[PDB]
Amino acid sequence: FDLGSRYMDLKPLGGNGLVFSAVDNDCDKRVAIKKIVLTDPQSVKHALREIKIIRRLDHDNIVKVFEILGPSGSQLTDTELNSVYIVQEYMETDLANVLEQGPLLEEHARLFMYQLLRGLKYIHSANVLHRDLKPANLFINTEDLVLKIGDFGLARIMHLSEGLVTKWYRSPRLLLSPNNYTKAIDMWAAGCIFAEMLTGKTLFAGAHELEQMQLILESIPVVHEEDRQELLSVIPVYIRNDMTEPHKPLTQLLPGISREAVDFLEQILTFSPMDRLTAEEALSHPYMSIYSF
Numbered sequence: 001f002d003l004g005s006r007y008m009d010l011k012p013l014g015g016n017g018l019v020f021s022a023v024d025n026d027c028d029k030r031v032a033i034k035k036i037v038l039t040d041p042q043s044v045k046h047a048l049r050e051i052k053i054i055r056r057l058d059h060d061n062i063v064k065v066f067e068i069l070g071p072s073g074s075q076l077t078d079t080e081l082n083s084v085y086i087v088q089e090y091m092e093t094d095l096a097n098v099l100e101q102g103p104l105l106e107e108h109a110r111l112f113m114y115q116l117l118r119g120l121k122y123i124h125s126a127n128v129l130h131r132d133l134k135p136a137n138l139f140i141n142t143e144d145l146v147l148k149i150g151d152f153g154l155a156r157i158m159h160l161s162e163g164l165v166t167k168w169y170r171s172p173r174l175l176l177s178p179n180n181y182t183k184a185i186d187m188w189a190a191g192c193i194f195a196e197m198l199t200g201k202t203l204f205a206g207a208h209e210l211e212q213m214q215l216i217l218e219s220i221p222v223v224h225e226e227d228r229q230e231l232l233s234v235i236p237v238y239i240r241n242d243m244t245e246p247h248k249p250l251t252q253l254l255p256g257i258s259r260e261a262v263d264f265l266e267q268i269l270t271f272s273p274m275d276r277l278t279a280e281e282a283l284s285h286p287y288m289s290i291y292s293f
Ligand SMILES: COc1ccc(-n2nnc3cnc(N[C@H]4CC[C@H](N)CC4)nc32)cc1
Pocket: 013, 016, 019, 032, 034, 063, 088, 089, 090, 091, 092, 093, 094, 097, 139, 150, 151
């Protein structure tokens, strides 16, 4: 199908019917077109918040955005329409799919982590937080082995529909304080992704916010007395008695994985965000310093 005098052969990616894979006749290449329907004055607020971010970011490990189109298919010069299309680079697959067929080799999991931390270093330098890091939002170009961070729909600079969001990659601070978003929150998610790349399975797979904390507390130790006293006053009684009970450490959740990868992960998956490595700190670590020239 057609969309304006540039994009031809629109084919979906499904059951959604809002994401397409068309070809640009002016460039003679494949592109991924995403549609955003506008009704709610908050849906316009989220669309405006996203466009400003995606048009400002240009990095080798970030999904490059080509154009922002209107309902007819004409480009936007930069509102109050009905539908807005977004043209992005087209990527082969996404890490969610890659993990579906099983764990990556320690050489591929390390390479993708380096590219994820390089991409995170760029967005955090521009004071932008991804706010939704998960394997589905990390796109893979299998032949060049290139990871590219995409889907900045939840991204913010510096509460509704919480059911449709995955809590599996949320930090303990984010589960206690959902209103505050920091650079450290993106780092915990990056750690959870690296552990999923090595094992194939989700490290902390919780149904809700409370169950997510219960699973994190079983493996991640609370070192600071400030965080420990806060938990005794916030997390419920059934989770409170469970943390003093014996459980599996992080090294037992990663069987067959080398101590170099586990000790690097133990520095990122810290309960307190103060002890946590940043994107710059993680890239300068001996486990990641080997990829830079
Ligand atoms: C929730 O719905 C979505 C899903 C994907 C995207 N985005 N956003 N940018 C993208 C660049 N490339 C691709 N390619 C697909 C091709 C098929 C593969 N199995 C998976 C990757 N998809 C993109 C946006 C919204």
